[PDB]
Swiss-Prot record:
The chain holds residues 1 to 103 of 624 of the full protein. It is linked to Amyotrophic lateral sclerosis 15, with or without frontotemporal dementia: A neurodegenerative disorder affecting upper motor neurons in the brain and lower motor neurons in the brain stem and spinal cord, resulting in fatal paralysis. Sensory abnormalities are absent. The pathologic hallmarks of the disease include pallor of the corticospinal tract due to loss of motor neurons, presence of ubiquitin-positive inclusions within surviving motor neurons, and deposition of pathologic aggregates. The ubiquitin-like domain is essential for its inhibitory effect on GPCR endocytosis. Mediates its association with the subunits of the proteasome. This is Ubiquilin-2. Transmembrane segments: none annotated. The gene is UBQLN2. The modification N-acetylalanine is found at A2. It comes from Homo sapiens (Human). Residues 15-32 have a biased composition (Low complexity). Degraded during macroautophagy. Induction: Highly expressed in mitotic cells from metaphase to telophase. Expression in non-mitotic cells is very low.
Length: 103
């Protein structure tokens, strides 16, 4: 992105225009799994694409819920519903309940 200074010239290769595609019949597995997150206020469920990482969902509650992000984590049966694993990969199979805590 920017880093502190950059004394690197042009690389050997050169990525240019190609068939990146993106607007031509392209689904994304809308298996929106339901995730019930408990916060210090009430119980609110969230919708997320079955193929999403916690890093994205983690920033979702911070902006919408307005509380935290780094320390913000979810306690699923003792485990840590966080970036360490994938919410759709174990934290939520199709509607699970987890406690929210900021450590």
């Amino acid at each position: 992105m920017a880093e502190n200074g950059e004394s690197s010239g042009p690389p050997r290769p050169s990525r240019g225009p190609a068939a990146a595609q993106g607007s031509a019949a392209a689904p994304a597995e809308p298996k929106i799994i339901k995730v019930t997150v408990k916060t210090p206020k009430e119980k609110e469920e969230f919708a997320v694409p079955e193929n999403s990482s916690v890093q994205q969902f983690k920033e979702a509650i911070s902006k919408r819920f307005k509380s935290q992000t780094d320390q913000l984590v979810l306690i699923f049966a003792g485990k840590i519903l966080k970036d360490q694993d994938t919410l759709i990969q174990h934290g939520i199979h199709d509607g699970l309940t987890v406690h929210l805590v900021i450590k």
